[PDB]
């Protein structure tokens, strides 16, 4: 029993695949990566995401059925699908190693360009230099410079409540470097406080399905480990980021 | 306590 699926790719094209009705997300992802020319190296740097809003996409958990998400959220409007292929990688050095892969470079470039437009990457200072490289279409040079800007390979979540703030909310920001909570109002306006947690201070982490919360336990300075709860709806996505960061840290090949 | 305090 076969069905067609549409999926958005980082360069703005879409692709369609014929997959079995009840396929899981990784089975759909492999089929797509086959249909677009991803080889055995490149395929591990991308994954399936769902568009939530103009400023947030969420990674599909392993036991989801992409076709069910496609059908549920389908409209006539462009792109014609809620599914999208995006980069999945926190260690920007692994990116460099792909600077000779035409497929990878092209996808990295076009998504990085979109992330700059959306404010995730803060070029600002060298905006003009990056614009000239963009206009001459020197993708690798563009990426090599943007890779030094604040916000590259950071995952920003929508603001939400937290059991360890008296009032207001937090915007969670995840990167290979640390785990950052930014203080904001209950409306989402950025206040002026940020806490950085190093990954080495993370003792355990977990989800709370019933309480719609991601949970982490840290041991900072000299005190005793405390649990913090972030009441995010995307708590399984957040847990996957933790597992993935530690995995990339374990297999890191460079002192840089 | 509050993270953004002490």
Swiss-Prot record, chain A:
Signal peptide: none annotated. Residues 153-253 are annotated as: FERM-like region F3. Residues 1-90 form the Ras-associating domain. Residues 1-90 are annotated as: FERM-like region F1. Transmembrane segments: none annotated. Residues 101-149 are annotated as: FERM-like region F2. It comes from the Eukaryota. It is found in: Early endosome membrane; Cytoplasm, Cytosol. Disulfide bonds: none annotated. Widely expressed. Expressed in cells of hematopoietic origin (at protein level). Involved in the retrograde transport from endosome to plasma membrane, a trafficking pathway that promotes the recycling of internalized transmembrane proteins. Following internalization, endocytosed transmembrane proteins are delivered to early endosomes and recycled to the plasma membrane instead of being degraded in lysosomes. The PDZ domain mediates binding to a subset of proteins containing a PDZ-binding motif at the C-terminus: the specificity for PDZ-binding motif is provided by the 2 residues located upstream of the canonical PDZ-binding motif. The PDZ domain also mediates binding to the retromer complex via direct interaction with VPS26 (VPS26A or VPS26B). Belongs to the sorting nexin family. Core component of the SNX27-retromer, a multiprotein complex composed of SNX27, the WASH complex and the retromer complex. Interacts (via PDZ domain) with a number of target transmembrane proteins (via PDZ-binding motif): ABCC4, ADRB2, ARHGEF7, GRIA1, GRIA2, GRIN1, GRIN2A GRIN2C, KCNJ6, KCNJ9 and SLC2A1/GLUT1. Interacts (via the FERM-like regions) with the WASH complex. Interacts with SNX1. Interacts with CYTIP. Isoform 1 and isoform 2 directly interact with DGKZ. Isoform 1 and isoform 2 interact with HT4R isoform 5-HTA(A). Interacts with MCC. This is Sorting nexin-27. The chain holds residues 273 to 528 of 541 of the full protein.
From Swiss-Prot, chain B:
It is found in: Early endosome membrane; Cell membrane. Coiled coil: none annotated. It comes from the Eukaryota. In human, WASHC2 has undergone evolutionary duplication, with 2 highly homologous family members WASHC2A and WASHC2C. Acts at least in part as component of the WASH core complex whose assembly at the surface of endosomes inhibits WASH nucleation-promoting factor (NPF) activity in recruiting and activating the Arp2/3 complex to induce actin polymerization and is involved in the fission of tubules that serve as transport intermediates during endosome sorting. Mediates the recruitment of the WASH core complex to endosome membranes via binding to phospholipids and VPS35 of the retromer CSC. Component of the WASH core complex also described as WASH regulatory complex (SHRC) composed of WASH (WASHC1, WASH2P or WASH3P), WASHC2 (WASHC2A or WASHC2C), WASHC3, WASHC4 and WASHC5; in the complex interacts (via N-terminus) directly with WASHC1. The WASH core complex associates with the F-actin-capping protein dimer (formed by CAPZA1, CAPZA2 or CAPZA3 and CAPZB) in a transient or substoichiometric manner which was initially described as WASH complex. Interacts with VPS35; mediates the association with the retromer CSC complex. Interacts with FKBP15. Belongs to the FAM21 family. The LFa (leucine-phenylalanine-acidic) motif bind directly to VPS35 of retromer CSC; adjacent motifs can act cooperatively to bind multiple CSCs, although there is significant variability in the affinities of different motifs for retromer. This is WASH complex subunit 2A. It comes from Homo sapiens. The gene is WASHC2A. The chain holds residues 1133 to 1138 of 1341 of the full protein.
């Amino acid at each position: 029993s076969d069905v067609e699926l549409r999926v958005a790719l980082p360069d703005g094209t879409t692709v369609t695949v014929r997959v079995k009705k009840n396929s899981t997300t990784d089975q759909v992802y492999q089929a797509i990566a086959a249909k677009v020319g991803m080889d055995s190296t490149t395929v591990n740097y991308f994954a399936l995401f769902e568009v939530i809003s103009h400023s947030f996409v969420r990674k599909l958990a392993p036991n989801e059925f992409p076709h069910k998400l496609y059908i549920q959220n389908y409209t006539s409007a462009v792109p014609g699908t809620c599914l999208t292929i995006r980069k999945w990688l926190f260690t920007t050095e692994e990116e460099i190693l792909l600077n000779d892969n035409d497929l990878a470079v092209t996808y990295f470039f076009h998504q990085a360009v979109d992330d700059v437009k959306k404010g995730y990457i803060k070029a600002e200072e060298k905006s003009y230099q990056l614009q000239k490289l963009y206009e001459q279409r020197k993708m690798v040079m563009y990426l090599n410079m943007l890779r030094t800007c604040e916000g590259y390979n950071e995952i920003i979540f929508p603001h939400c409540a937290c059991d360890s703030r008296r009032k207001g909310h937090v915007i969670t920001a995840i990167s290979i470097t640390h785990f950052k909570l930014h203080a904001c109002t209950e409306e989402g306006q950025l206040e002026n406080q940020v806490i950085a947690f190093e990954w080495d201070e993370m003792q355990r982490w977990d989800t709370d399905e019933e309480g719609m919360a991601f949970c982490f336990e840290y041991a900072r300075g000299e005190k005793k480990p405390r649990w913090v709860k972030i009441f995010t709806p995307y708590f399984n996505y957040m847990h996957e980021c933790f597992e993935r960061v530690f995995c990339e840290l374990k297999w890191r090949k460079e002192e840089y | 306590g509050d993270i953004f305090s002490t």
